[PDB]
Structure formats: structure tokens, C-alpha cells
Amino acid sequence: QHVDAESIMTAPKGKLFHLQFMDGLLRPEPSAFDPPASGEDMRLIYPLQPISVARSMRAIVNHNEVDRPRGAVAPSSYEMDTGTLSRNGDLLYSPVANG
Amino acid sequence: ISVARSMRAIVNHNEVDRPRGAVAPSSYEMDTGTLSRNGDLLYSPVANGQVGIPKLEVDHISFSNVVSMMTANIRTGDDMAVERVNPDDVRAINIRNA
Amino acid sequence: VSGLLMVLFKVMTDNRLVIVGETTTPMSNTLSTVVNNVLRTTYHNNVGVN
Amino acid sequence: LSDDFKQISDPKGYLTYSVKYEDQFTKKDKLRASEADDRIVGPTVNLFK
């Protein structure tokens, strides 16, 4: 889904735009003998605030078998903390350290 | 004869006892060793701290060995290509300079 | 004698270069401990014979 | 009785994981696992393939 600069400038004030943004973390390296690129890929639109507030995990591949890719994200510990119930019955996280 | 023999009489004499004349495989058949720093195969060190004898150095056969490998086919990529651009004028070429 | 020579020739000209074949990473709890010790994470499905 | 509640089994959450894959990445060493452990752990390992 594409967006001219003209539409970014002249869209109604109340309407929700729908931008797209690449995560190019999982783009494999060029072959050693791919022809050189004289051209320069260019960009105009950027977010002003963090996007990917919803992100839990990222780049689930291996960089060099053992190493971690730059920009990969492991899930937050809280996703995995089955805690217990408080005496009134509310959910709790596990105690951290002691006591 | 039976210089080639590795094992023999793979049956039980009396359930637990060994048949006379049965042969267990030589230990060397089973010694995946390691590689020497130059990359030759070696047997495991015997006792300590003596360095492992290279497998080619001695006459025993060994069937567990460490082979190096490419993780995947290396011919997979695009072939190299160049942009030859022959000279503008043949008469202007400087074949001199020796 | 000729055969030895050709053996010796065929080895002198063995230009083979191994690439990893299909392989498996058995989940360990699924292997008996004697085999779990011998095993090192992964192995070719064509294990061969030792 | 009044139907004050709606009895259910294996409940929906309010939040779910959603995943975008790049299909070209794939580990070559197939990982055999216990059939039981595969049936506990398995929806997860598929979703986070």
C-alpha cells in the first residue's frame, strides 16, 4: 500500500492514514558477485514515536548459528511468569528475590 | 588368513559366557579422536597427559572420524560476471613500457 | 599389484568434498543414555555403522 | 435457573500472538521430539517457527 507526498499533505484532518513500515532485520546478505548498485534507494516518511509497541518477539533466526542478530527481541519475562493467586483471588507475578 | 577380520562369533556361549575364539572389535575402530592443530586425524590421548597419536601414523583401522564439511552447497550462488570495455583507438594503445 | 596401484591411483585423485546431508536433532529424552552420550546434538540420518 | 453465566471450555483470551514469517529462512537440521512433548509444546513451536 503506497502513499504520495501529495496525499500525506492533503488528507482530511480527521481521517486515519494507514502507513506501512519495513522491518528489514531479516534481509539476507547480497551474493559476493551481485552487480554493484550505482542507484541510491531513498526514503521520506518516518514515524515520530515508537511503532511496534505491540511487538513481543523479533528476528527468530540465528545470526551465524550461535550469535544473536542485532535488533532481535526476546519475549518479556512477564509473558512467561505464571505467578499465583493473592489471598483475595487476584493474579500476581512471582515474588522477585526474597522475601 | 583372516587379517581382515574385525569381529567373530557374535552369539552367546551359555547366555553369559564368551565362545572360545570369538573376537571383539579393536578399540581403534571405535575411537573418534579429534583433529590436530594442522588438521590431521588423531586417536584419543591415552592416559595423561600424552598427545594423541595420529591415525595415519599407525596401522589400525578406525571407523569413527571427524570430517569437516560445508554446511550447505557452495556452488549455489550466482557466477561472477565482468564488464569488459575494450580501448577506444587501437593506434593509441601503449604496448611499450615493456 | 595392479589393483593396489589403481586403489592408490583412485585415492590420489579423490576430489570429493563433503556437504552436510539431511540431519536430525533427537530430543535427547527420546534417546537411551548410552546413545545420548555418544551423540553430539546432531547427526546424519545416514548414521553408517560402528 | 437464570443463565447468569456462559459456561465454556478452553477459553479465548483478549490478546493473541500474531506472527509474520519470512518463509525463506529454515533450519536444515530437523528436530525430532517426543510425541507427547510435541503435543504440549507443539502449537507454540509452530507459531514461533
Partner: peptide, 26 residues
Amino acid sequence: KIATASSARQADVEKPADVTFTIENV
């Protein structure tokens, strides 16, 4: 029945290296 004997050698399974298009690593 008559007693019998048999033989077996380990088989070759060498094959040209497979061409995969998928890649293990970023």
C-alpha cells in the same frame, strides 16, 4: 528345515550435494 547362511555389506548412499534455496541464517 535346513540350516543356512547369508551375507551383508554396508551400502553406499553417497549423493551429489542437494541444492537448497532456503537459508539457515540472516
